[PDB]
Amino acid sequence: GHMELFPVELEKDEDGLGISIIGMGVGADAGLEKLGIFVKTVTEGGAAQRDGRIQVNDQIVEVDGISLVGVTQNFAATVLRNTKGNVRFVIGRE
């Protein structure tokens, strides 16, 4: 396939996302080996799993324009915490 870097402007609740990430440096094998921040969990539905474009098996490339390409789970969890209702998840996946 092709790695689609896609923007997802999610319209979440006033709480936020209620999602979780996982920091696991991806041994991409290709040589690039990008950020290993995958989505760990998502809220039971909210508007995220009820949105449909975003998944719990995806990988956070850039949220809110913060470009967390190569960060730890601390950084990433912070980003997905700092978010509000309207979030621009620029996730990229094949």
UniProtKB/Swiss-Prot annotation:
It comes from the Eukaryota. Disulfide bonds: none annotated. Brain, and widely expressed in neural tissue. Highly concentrated in synapses of developed neurons. In developing neurons, concentrated in the lamellipodia of the growth cone. Residues 7-94 form the PDZ domain. It is found in: Cytoplasm, Cytoskeleton; Synapse, Synaptosome. Binds to actin filaments (F-actin) and shows cross-linking activity. Binds along the sides of the F-actin. May be involved in neurite formation. Inhibits protein phosphatase 1-alpha activity. May play an important role in linking the actin cytoskeleton to the plasma membrane at the synaptic junction. Interacts with p70-S6K via its PDZ domain. Possibly exists as a homodimer, homotrimer or a homotetramer. Interacts with F-actin, protein phosphatase 1 (PP1), neurabin-2, TGN38 and p70-S6K. This is Neurabin-1. The gene is Ppp1r9a. The chain holds residues 502 to 592 of 1095 of the full protein.
